[PDB]
Amino acid sequence: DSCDRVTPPAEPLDRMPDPYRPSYGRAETVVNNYIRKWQQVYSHRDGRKQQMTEEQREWLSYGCVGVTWVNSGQYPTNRLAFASFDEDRFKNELKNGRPRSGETRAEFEGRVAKESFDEEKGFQRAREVASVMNRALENAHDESAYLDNLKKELANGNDALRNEDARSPFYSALRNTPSFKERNGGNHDPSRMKAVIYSKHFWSGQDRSSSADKRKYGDPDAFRPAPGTGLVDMSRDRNIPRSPTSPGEGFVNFDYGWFGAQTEADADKTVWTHGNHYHAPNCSLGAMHVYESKFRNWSEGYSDFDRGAYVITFIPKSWNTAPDKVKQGWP
Ligand SMILES: [Cl-]
């Protein structure tokens, strides 16, 4: 089919990207140009810039998932994920609120649940937790010290995460990162790793054997964070999209936005890299374009999605795909 995915060609390591700038919070560029930028600013290994490999271009060509895939070295598991949900707002709205004109019960419940998430607070929580984890490895040369350090700070902050099982997504995140266990990567040395964040936007009602109503309008009970830790159980995420209502509407299953480990104190100024869709240059769907959005442009989302997870994982310190400072556009 002419809409078949294409792997973009190799870009010479010295090829400079074309200029582009954000418009109302979002910069974008065709994937070929993004590869050029990536090579210049994110490719470094031990401070040495590198060409994006044929394999990485293949990954990248899958779309927004591909940005995160390349940057972390791994197809996203989303196993360790946070969100902020206002349980009080939700239950009150259900009890005392009145459905908007025409809304059925299921529509209303779906909406009130979508609206009771706060993506800024969800990101803030992931970021805070990531920094604890980063402090915990800073001078830990074995996992054992890392877990000690981590527990100390969580106990000192009287954090709900302090109570997670030893086998939980949270405590097992580090040792379950492939690159932690490479001699080239972390070499079982926590201090040679870095916590990194990305976000997934996705649909709550993915279960084939619940109501049509949930598939269409959202499942208010699905992907609610644990109120204490803020952890989201992503185990029931099956990459299934919202089912349509309106005649010509279609929905995609997800969006993925890469944050990395930017130091910027203002969450709103953080840059999130995602994209439109997989690379389809031979068809009217068109080439993949990469988007670099300020947080609020990211967090705004789309009708396709009523859920957002802020995921933590790890990469080797020696990489440079999560630098302290990320710029939208070029130069
Ligand atoms: Cl191409």
Side-chain angles (χ1 to χ4, degrees):
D1 170 305
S2 76
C3 282
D4 281 0
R5 179 200 61 73
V6 170
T7 307
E11 288 290 338
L13 179 147
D14 58 337
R15 235 259 222 193
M16 293 310 269
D18 292 348
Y20 67 108
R21 279 182 68 96
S23 172
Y24 304 107
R26 181 172 289 174
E28 67 81 21
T29 200
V30 57
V31 58
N32 313 98
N33 197 48
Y34 190 71
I35 292 161
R36 301 179 195 122
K37 174 182 181 177
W38 188 92
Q39 290 180 164
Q40 305 305 312
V41 301
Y42 305 130
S43 60
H44 302 74
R45 296 163 86 111
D46 303 288
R48 324 267 86 179
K49 82 172 69 167
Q50 320 273 316
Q51 204 168 35
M52 187 181 285
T53 68
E54 146 80 22
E55 171 143 275
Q56 290 173 326
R57 300 194 314 279
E58 295 193 45
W59 290 353
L60 180 183
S61 73
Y62 279 91
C64 49
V65 75
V67 170
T68 291
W69 198 350
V70 170
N71 291 342
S72 62
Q74 297 289 327
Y75 195 90
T77 62
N78 308 316
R79 212 170 98 97
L80 206 207
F82 292 89
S84 151
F85 183 92
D86 179 345
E87 286 285 349
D88 181 63
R89 192 187 177 289
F90 172 76
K91 81 132 167 40
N92 176 60
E93 228 344 74
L94 276 215
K95 194 196 171 202
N96 302 327
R98 42 209 304 102
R100 315 273 217 226
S101 55
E103 284 188 313
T104 70
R105 230 308 126 158
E107 274 182 298
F108 169 65
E109 290 196 2
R111 180 169 54 80
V112 159
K114 176 192 160 81
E115 292 185 338
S116 298
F117 287 88
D118 176 336
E119 279 204 26
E120 184 159 76
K121 281 217 269 74
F123 163 46
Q124 177 179 313
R125 167 67 165 158
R127 177 166 210 200
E128 281 161 5
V129 176
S131 302
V132 176
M133 293 172 105
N134 276 330
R135 279 181 296 276
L137 54 74
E138 232 52 313
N139 40 260
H141 291 286
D142 53 28
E143 197 199 8
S144 167
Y146 158 72
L147 291 174
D148 266 347
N149 294 344
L150 184 45
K151 290 169 166 159
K152 183 195 169 167
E153 189 170 346
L154 293 171
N156 252 324
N158 296 107
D159 199 291
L161 287 162
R162 181 53 186 85
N163 285 322
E164 287 294 296
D165 293 337
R167 298 236 146 105
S168 59
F170 176 70
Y171 278 119
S172 80
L174 173 62
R175 71 181 177 256
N176 287 348
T177 309
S179 60
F180 173 68
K181 282 160 301 172
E182 303 324 81
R183 154 143 179 57
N184 33 129
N187 204 209
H188 294 73
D189 186 345
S191 66
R192 292 182 84 213
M193 298 292 288
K194 219 215 301 209
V196 291
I197 289 164
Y198 65 89
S199 179
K200 192 182 183 171
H201 288 152
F202 67 99
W203 180 248
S204 62
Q206 296 183 42
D207 178 10
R208 261 105 188 210
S209 50
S210 78
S211 47
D213 271 352
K214 284 179 181 154
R215 290 266 314 103
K216 288 169 56 205
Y217 296 140
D219 183 354
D221 289 322
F223 310 101
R224 296 268 284 280
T229 53
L231 294 164
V232 176
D233 180 0
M234 290 298 284
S235 83
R236 295 191 49 77
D237 181 12
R238 288 138 45 74
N239 304 301
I240 280 164
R242 179 184 189 170
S243 53
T245 296
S246 312
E249 98 194 315
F251 295 117
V252 74
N253 46 12
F254 48 65
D255 198 356
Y256 278 95
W258 178 265
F259 163 79
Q262 290 160 60
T263 58
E264 178 51 56
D266 182 357
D268 290 352
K269 284 195 205 97
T270 66
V271 179
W272 293 69
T273 306
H274 49 134
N276 57 358
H277 53 67
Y278 73 95
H279 190 47
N282 302 136
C283 102
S284 70
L285 190 71
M288 169 173 170
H289 284 224
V290 175
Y291 292 166
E292 290 168 319
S293 294
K294 284 187 149 170
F295 180 63
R296 287 134 35 275
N297 300 74
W298 164 251
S299 66
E300 183 180 304
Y302 301 90
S303 281
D304 308 58
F305 316 122
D306 60 358
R307 289 296 184 276
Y310 290 84
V311 175
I312 297 168
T313 186
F314 292 89
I315 61 165
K317 277 224 210 324
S318 80
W319 289 14
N320 198 33
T321 64
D324 289 356
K325 191 113 19 157
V326 168
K327 297 162 139 45
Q328 284 176 297
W330 194 263

